Symmetry: D2
């Protein structure tokens, strides 16, 4: 099946930033024709550690910006919702509605997303065991979702640290397509001052592990200049490095593919 | 005074709340050194299964809780799950509770603080004790004056929670601390036998109050059936923690 | 039953240090007559993180020093062994033979201790679940041990951190007397540079929790001047604070005792 | 060359070692790009139960291993549990293995280093990746020249281990890194279905070798029966990791 690559700047810092990243993603989509690219960006960071951190410019602005990306580049779109009422307006532009990790058990949010008819991607909560995502998929199916994804983004491992238990990939594949979040998985929750920390040096090696184990897609946040990002400045991948990373995972996926176990 | 938040996990019926409210009212009259707060959820918005009991809705819930407050004169507390619910709930709830999974949702916290009511935040199973400082700050920014942080366990491997008692003195630096005696022993995805021993630990360490879900017939409860405390055992546990607190309080560290 | 208090300097820095601490422990044993005091000190720190850290002055010197303490003060003695051959010589002075946490599964070490006829205290490994200590007690009984203790000293919680799951106390009590290690439970494994870290501010509160939950004794390392200790300088309790801590736990134990559940 | 350490968990008999040694010898001739090392323990010194299989003793063990080395010309590796065992084991063992629970026992490490043989230390389930730097230093101080660190999982809650692949690049800073594919999926106090996928992960990330326990009839093994790899599946897995390594190696980060 076609491999999915969900990528984009963490937050919608401005419509200009989006178009700049979208342009590169469009270029890569023309090169890597065997990949289905989905542009991602959050119109709101509703769970920042600090009240002083950047959140966004509002739902209205964000949807408008994402719509511009889809219009100008013909790219599929995905963004996350935080309360049930946002599902309807967001579904107007989003091809895939994303459910935040902390909210993966909020029944009404899941139901709100499912009834839009759009695909739904649920970030696996840091508190959830792999086998407990079965009921998450069940809720979505109950709500009408026909295209469901589960995203591995790390599990709570002691304080301010996450570990990726790759056994989750084959387990979750039993009931949904699986995506590996290469950037949030290496972040150190509340690691820094009133902000999240992260170790970019592990992004690439862990993504290689994900494709070797076997997944249906990868999720990566990318920014022209990560150091200047308003969110996840420590983990967002430099846009110039995206091409090489994608090429590498396609190569590893190809050679490992014949060994992927049947679920 | 020492805070004791208790009541049935979910508002299974106005009838159930009244029966429990009566016992809590009696204990309230027997223990003047304690401030009792009646708790019950109008909606279990985060159940694991879509086929599990959620409740009868916000209106039916706020109505039943109002009946408890008016009939017994007890303070009330219930949890909210989305921002719009803060206002209507604040009509009856003296303390607005923020669910553990939602402790980082800025709009929910701000919505609760705006009501002018006290706010009790369940510490997420993914949060470190020191990470709660930011939670309190959000609430203060939102205008909250009476703020509580509730210890309810931390993710420890899969389908298990551990209570790191170091969290009590750490969180006390920025808020009043409550120990959730029933959810802390629950196995996500629990053991009633550990409820009492851990609550004894909490008061020996030092906290500002305890949270306990209680039900007349726990095994018949529509939620947390394996962990809700039988109503008849509530008095004994309260007396026990008051006695332990009386002796141990001499050693509670300053700030 | 008589409450057990195992205390002493972490390592046998010198025979003089031992006698100084022993003198205070003897004084407290005369005051707290309802407590059974056991003097503890390691003749060897065989598991230091760094090859450059203090280990000790040898088994011969240590046993001689411990014997002096028992002779001069009439105090019971306990020390830990690291290899089977040490059980015999150590049993000549030790009333309780201690089994290190990392070695709680080494069958021959356990058997070596059991056949000496002495009491055996096993530190629960940081990797062991409470219910898995049942087989540890089984091995000891198989080897002839008639007086067995299991010591709670924390469990691996993420990297360089330990958490105390107090549910372990009532669980382990099902098959052995339980001791709470108040000082090692708050140490941060490899936290510092080539050494262990620790948070002394949590020693007292956690010990209060242990007695409130219910245990058969407490283990505390104490030193005249912790800051100068050659091992566990961050967690050893100042000797001057021992009296107050013991008084406090006896008071909390008394008031909580009527509520201790029957196993 | 890439290292592949394989063999039956325990020396159940000289007979068993020979049968496994034959297959490993064959693979050794088929894969010249790989250095095979035959492994088997003469004693399971840390079994959970006193009634479980330990072995036939050190002498019988060193004897059987010597037979494998002489008959097939394969390098040998076995683990030691107490200092005195280093010398006699070094007579046949090319690489002396240090058990995970004993990775901090200074005298065992020094005893192994003194033999002049290579030393492979299983990373304790309680150790952080960076904590292994000190382990290597002890060995260097003891005179060790060829040093390996083996990833075999980290304590994750109770009766479960997780493999934090970040450990591979971290440990590589001070030693050659080996990934233990069979013990990493074991549930202390395991799932064979996860052995292959995680070994693929290990080579994609980048390691210097893999460790795998294999047995003709795993379900009949006297130890690690639930995790030992069936002998017949060994060739396929090796070919697979060589292919993945060939492609992925282009991206292994420097130092
Ligand atoms: Zn992000
Ligand atoms: Zn409940
Ligand atoms: Zn010590
Ligand atoms: Zn094995």
């Amino acid at each position: 099946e076609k491999f999915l690559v969900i990528a984009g700047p963490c937050a919608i810092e401005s419509e200009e930033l989006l178009l700049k990243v979208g342009e590169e993603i469009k270029r890569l989509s023309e090169k890597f024709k065997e990949v289905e690219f989905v542009f991602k960006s959050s119109f709101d960071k509703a769970n920042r550690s600090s009240i002083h951190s950047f959140r966004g410019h509002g739902l209205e602005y964000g949807v408008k910006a994402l719509r511009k990306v889809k219009e100008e580049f013909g790219l599929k779109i995905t963004t996350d919702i935080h309360e049930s009422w946002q599902a309807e307006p967001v579904a107007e532009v989003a091809d895939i509605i994303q459910i935040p990790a902390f909210l993966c058990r909020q029944t009404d949010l899941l139901l709100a997303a499912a009834k839009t008819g759009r695909a739904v991607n649920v970030k696996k909560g840091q508190f959830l065991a792999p086998w407990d995502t079965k009921n998450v998929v069940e809720k979505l199916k109950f709500g009408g979702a026909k295209e469901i994804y589960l995203t591995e983004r790390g599990t709570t491992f002691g304080y301010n640290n996450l570990v990726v238990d790759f056994r989750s990939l084959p387990i979750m594949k039993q009931w949904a397509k699986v995506i590996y979040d290469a950037t949030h998985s290496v972040q150190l929750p509340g690691g820094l001052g009133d902000k999240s920390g992260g170790m970019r040096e592990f992004i690439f090696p862990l993504i290689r592990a994900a494709v070797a184990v076997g997944c249906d897609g990868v999720f990566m946040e990318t920014h022209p200049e990560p150091e200047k990002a308003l969110s996840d400045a420590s983990t967002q991948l430099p846009l110039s490095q995206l091409e090489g990373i994608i090429e590498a995972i396609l190569e590893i996926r190809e050679v490992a593919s014949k060994y992927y176990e049947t679920i």
